[PDB]
Amino acid sequence: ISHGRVFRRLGLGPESRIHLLQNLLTGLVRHERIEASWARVDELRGYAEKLIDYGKLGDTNERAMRMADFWLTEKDLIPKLFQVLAPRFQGQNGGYTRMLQIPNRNEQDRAKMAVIEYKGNCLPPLPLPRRDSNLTLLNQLLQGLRQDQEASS
Amino acid sequence: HGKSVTWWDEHLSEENVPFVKQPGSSRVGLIALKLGMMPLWTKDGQKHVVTLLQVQDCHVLKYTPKENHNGRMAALTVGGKTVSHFHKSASILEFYQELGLPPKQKVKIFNVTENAVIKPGTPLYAAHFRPGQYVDVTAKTIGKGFQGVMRRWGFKGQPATHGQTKTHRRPGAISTGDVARVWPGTKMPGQLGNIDRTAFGLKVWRINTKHNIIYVNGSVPGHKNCLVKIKDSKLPAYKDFCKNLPFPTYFPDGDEEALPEDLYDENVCQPGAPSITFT
Amino acid sequence: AAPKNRRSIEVNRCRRRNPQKLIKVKNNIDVCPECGHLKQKHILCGYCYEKVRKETAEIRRQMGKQEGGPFRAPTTETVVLYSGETPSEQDQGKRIIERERKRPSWFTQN
Amino acid sequence: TARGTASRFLTSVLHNGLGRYVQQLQRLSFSLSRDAPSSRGAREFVEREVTDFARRNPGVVIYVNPRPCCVPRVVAEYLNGAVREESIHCKSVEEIAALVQKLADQSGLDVIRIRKPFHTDSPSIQGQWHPFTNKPTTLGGLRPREVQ
Amino acid sequence: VKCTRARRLKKRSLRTLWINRITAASQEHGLKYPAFIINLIKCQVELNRKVLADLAIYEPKTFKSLAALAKRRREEGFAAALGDGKEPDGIFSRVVQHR
Amino acid sequence: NTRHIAFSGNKWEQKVYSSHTGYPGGFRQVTAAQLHQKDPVAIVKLAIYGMLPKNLHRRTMMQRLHLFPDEDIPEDILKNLVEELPQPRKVPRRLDEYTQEEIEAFPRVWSPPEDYRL
RNA sequence: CGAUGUUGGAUCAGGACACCCAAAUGGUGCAACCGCUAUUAAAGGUUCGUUUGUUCAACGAUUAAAGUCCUACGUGAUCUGAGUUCAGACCGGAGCAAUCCAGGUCGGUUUCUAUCUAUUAUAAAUUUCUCCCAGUACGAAAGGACAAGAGAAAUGGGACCAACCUCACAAACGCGUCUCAGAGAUAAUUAAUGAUUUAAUCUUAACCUAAUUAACUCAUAAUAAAUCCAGCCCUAGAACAGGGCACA
RNA sequence: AACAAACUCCUAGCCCAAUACCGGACUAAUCUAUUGAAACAUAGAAGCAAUAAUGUUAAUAUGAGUAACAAGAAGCCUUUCUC
């Protein structure tokens, strides 16, 4: 029975799961856009969201300093986080990262892939799923309803 | 024609998505939501447990006559909590468009005598139940999936340490040597939990008017935040308790006086109480 | 346990041609509006993501060329410019990534 | 085996023998040899009986072909269009005469199982049984529980 | 082997079918099959059950005449039995010899 | 008129109808009186169902059988009818259906004494 | 005999009644309570320990009782191997010896990946123990009731985490909590009316009757709105299915 | 009464069941002696006929796409992280 379980089984146990997600978070912090399996990236998204919230607490906060020391295993990334990522994310509360589904790997595994990235990264944009324009037929027909609702008030 | 699949959010643009988003008679039962559980205390000092059943949106949907449903009692159709338009089916939205109400989650059928019929499209409230009464509660129980025979039926297992090899949870012998088969009534591992069960004879202690919350005594089958089918008790000892109830149904408009906020049974220790002492 | 009799080809055909063991059709195949290739509706286009991945690999290689150490990371923000472009006043104070090829149609200035 | 082979009804083609009898055998072609010992019965049949058979049956055409063949054959073709091979290899003269007479007395249809040993057209003289041919009529044509 | 044995049983099966058909078409006239058979034989009419079923299927008036003959012979035999005498000999109880 | 069925002799209490539901302890032997009390068409349905030959046409030919407990037939069925078969048993009438002409026509067998009480 | 693997237990039990308990009665050398027999009824139960490999058996504490059997004296393609039933070894005895034992003791490999049949959850309770009945009925006293009514528990079925406990996941879990039912029907046995047999007499004589066990059915409860299903979540789930994705 | 055989009649015949053993008439496929030359005849010879030996060799099926096997992570691709 898996009722009320939010953490999925990864690696060789809980410690190995924490270490693999630590490696993924270190790579995401260093490169600002990484691709991996869909489940590992989906687990990584919450860690990457709360890491920005811990970096928001300031450089002088000892708990955040030790959290970043443990989780960012390459020691150059802690000044990089506290002087790049935390000043850049100030206004928005929880919109730090983007998760998108990459097509399956060309290796024989045919695993389901996802790419994770941060906002404002210095990289070319991913081919985001664009909505229809407002000149499209259904959008124009609904803008007619919107105009008649504005004319009714 | 190899037509592709579509949904409501496919062809909508970001400027239009928030635009789219913007003596022998029987009574009528309710559909509620199991909120949680609370302690409660009585004036003799004992402690009971109440399950919280919140009515959020309860409306009678359609009425099936006596001769077209069962031949003894008519059928009244009651819907549950209100869900989205976009994820329901076309015929369901068409019949609810003719009815006049937004889509409901669960749809249930109640057996109701002809003198207790309610015109369809009528809302219902928790003051339909009065403090001090006995109710029957029907719900889908907590689904435990494909469970073994030890958890599903309660069989004693084989010992663990005394040499037994690959045996510790298996049922063992399932049938008899002569009959050369296994009986249809044999207890065997399989699906456990996702079935419709009814608890009988649950006592109501308190009705909360504004949030429409019924407090029932004991355990309600099913997990928290599901939809729960509530009716009166069909036990033989509680047959004739219909007389002191508001029995067309509860009408808040016809009374034209306000009910109290919290309606209690006379044995309940209130939150506002003299902090009872003995003598 | 050992089988008692050989399964015949009629029963084998019934087992192996049953519709739950067949490959189901996919109705979410759509054409990409940019390149005209094929993609699923909930999945990014492989051709477009290959372009983005190759440009990202080129950018990452050329910025790893500028820094000679594995343990040296930028203290400030990074900006990228192509041939025929100059860093802006709001882009000053940030490290500069120069590339010789022309700026793509998909990649904006910002 | 009836379930293994095909079946046909008893049928006379062109309604033979009704107005007049027409011998439906058209031709025989014998393929024999002058040298082989297996063609001996065919050779003696050619010497004695073929001319008398031709006098008895003026409606058939008899061809004789002495060619260097090992197995003597006779091929009978009918008015229906049917062709039938027969092997006359190493048989006595009376056996050959019996075989030719049996081929002459046949109609030419396919020799398979006959479903029924009779054929009839219009068998429904003086009516045919239907469930109402013996049930008496009720006054007014009434149903048993219908009231008028 | 089943072909030869079912060829043997074919005559019995077809005979049983003929008896069922004669029983049906005789009970349709309100006369039982054994009474119909023995009273048709007692009039020196020797038709086998194949052609009797054939008359029963394709020949309703002729089978009605045969059933009437059998019923008349049955009533004549019952009358001659209850008479207890040799002097009354009926019109259909007379016995015709070969010539 | 399936409800008005009659058994010769004591078959109403002696004759049983039995079935098994498959589960252990699921053997039901119901007396014919109780079975006719519960389901009136069950007796005639099981009699025809047992008497019909045991081939696969059996289910198909009970699909053409219609059984009604009393004289309440649908009109679509009523307009389909052709003829009514005669009943196989001549129903005996009681004393009250006999007319007084038949009562005085039947001779008196014996002469009772006048001093007796009936 | 080109193999039908054997005792006891572990798990699961199906059935019969020649019934141990529970229930309805008849006779008693039946005053009451204990008893002894006889009839009907198999929906449900029939305990925990010491010794022995034990089935049995003895004993300790109990219970409403600790039933007799069939099921390859059920069940080893679910298990156990203590004994039997291999190969090693002692003691008593027989045999000159090798060896022998319904004569004892230590130790002694228990395979299988399921092809086919079969099967893989609807309910509508049961039994004890207290208080009254009352120390009333019945009795010379010792003794000592049945029925009716209030309560508690336990067993079994179905469920659930407000608290305790397991608990370093929001959950699962018990050691914790909640609920558990009306009508008809009967077998044996008592009666009312009344003929053959104008008395009587419960009737394989009718007519209407009652008093009455367990089953068994049915009131009653559950399911019981057809064709949007790409993706995401789920207290829903092996896969497939199922419920949500407008509030916020 | 009826329905009901390998019994018995009817119409034709090539005119009466069988294990171990015994007798007889034919004949499938080769070689040879003479015929024959769209593949046969009369004779002389045998390595002279396979639905069966847990038969031998070879290829296939069923069990079965079942049991079972493996490469730590990211990236600038051989540079850093976790054991």
Ligand SMILES: Nc1nc2c(ncn2[C@@H]2O[C@H](COP(=O)(O)O)[C@@H](O)[C@H]2O)c(=O)[nH]1
């Ligand atoms: N000794 C003997 N055995 C016979 C005789 N007839 C038949 N048998 C035996 O019977 C068996 C065959 O019987 P069937 O299967 O032919 O009825 C064989 O064992 C065969 O040897 C006989 O006459 N004498």
Ligand SMILES: [Mg+2]
């Ligand atoms: Mg794993």
Ligand SMILES: [Mg+2]
């Ligand atoms: Mg679940």
Ligand SMILES: [Mg+2]
């Ligand atoms: Mg255990």
Ligand SMILES: [Mg+2]
């Ligand atoms: Mg072991």
Ligand SMILES: [Mg+2]
């Ligand atoms: Mg183990």
Ligand SMILES: [Mg+2]
């Ligand atoms: Mg083992």
Ligand SMILES: [Mg+2]
């Ligand atoms: Mg069997």
Ligand SMILES: [Mg+2]
């Ligand atoms: Mg014959």
Ligand SMILES: [Mg+2]
């Ligand atoms: Mg043996």
Ligand SMILES: [Mg+2]
């Ligand atoms: Mg064998």
Ligand SMILES: [Mg+2]
């Ligand atoms: Mg049992």
Ligand SMILES: [Mg+2]
């Ligand atoms: Mg007792």
Ligand SMILES: [Mg+2]
């Ligand atoms: Mg008994």
Ligand SMILES: [Mg+2]
């Ligand atoms: Mg029992």
Ligand SMILES: [Mg+2]
């Ligand atoms: Mg023990």
